[PDB]
Amino acid sequence: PTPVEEAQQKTIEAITKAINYMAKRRIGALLTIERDTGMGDYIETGIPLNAKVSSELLINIFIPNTPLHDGAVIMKNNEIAAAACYLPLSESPFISKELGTRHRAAVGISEVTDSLTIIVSEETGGVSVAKNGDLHRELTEEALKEMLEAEF
Amino acid sequence: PTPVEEAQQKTIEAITKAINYMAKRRIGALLTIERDTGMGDYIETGIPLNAKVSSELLINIFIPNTPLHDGAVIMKNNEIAAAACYLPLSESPFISKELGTRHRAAVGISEVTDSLTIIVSEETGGVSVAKNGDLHRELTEEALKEMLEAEFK
């Protein structure tokens, strides 16, 4: 494939490996992938990383009770742009009432951008995605990978 | 001050803040700063980051029982080049006998490069620096700062 396509595939492999690891351990996570709507305003609220993606770095960021774990990681293409970022909280009535701030933040950013946000619940380990104002819950590993591949 | 000087001071402050946090909690850490001797061969053994330095990222890297905490962070050109890197273990018979692998790795890289390596002991939280084959132990915060400033001058 082209180098761009191979890089995308490595980035998807890194994300899915990290999400699977965190889901199994009930490590809460909030990971927004910038698409065509620029997210600079939100990136600038966090700690700048501009780091190459790896499953290892993604996992290390979200370990509970650490400086970087609260708030969103925002990725730009094949880089982790920043961690511990603010995202706006959705007021949508279609967010399950038991869900906390990570899911509301994910839906919130999905209402004002075309980004794709992945959430791992610290309560259940369930994996969800927010896109275009909708939250899709309880994703299998296969469904998440397919969503990421389709998102390119 | 110049942009480069302000950048160097910001990086020193980020390092010292992270080392203080880890020393207080007795979190083992191993952080090598590349100088004139290139360390690409050791950087290539770790996980690539090429990340901006922050105290927060340094702390998150070394949290125990995590993917990135085992091995050395190597800094180059004011960035974190890679984490979980291999460094060669010193065979020097003159390292304190109570010290283990992190300290021997720091002394080892210091024997074959002009780099400066910071170690935090997981046993005591003591802070030490390896340079030129020697280990400087039980450093105060002021002593570590002076070494970092002397190195970057």
Ligand SMILES: CC[C@H](N)c1ccccc1O
């Ligand atoms: C308890 C931390 C300790 N005072 C320390 C912290 C950072 C650097 C050196 C050093 O001796």
Ligand SMILES: [Mg+2]
């Ligand atoms: Mg369902």
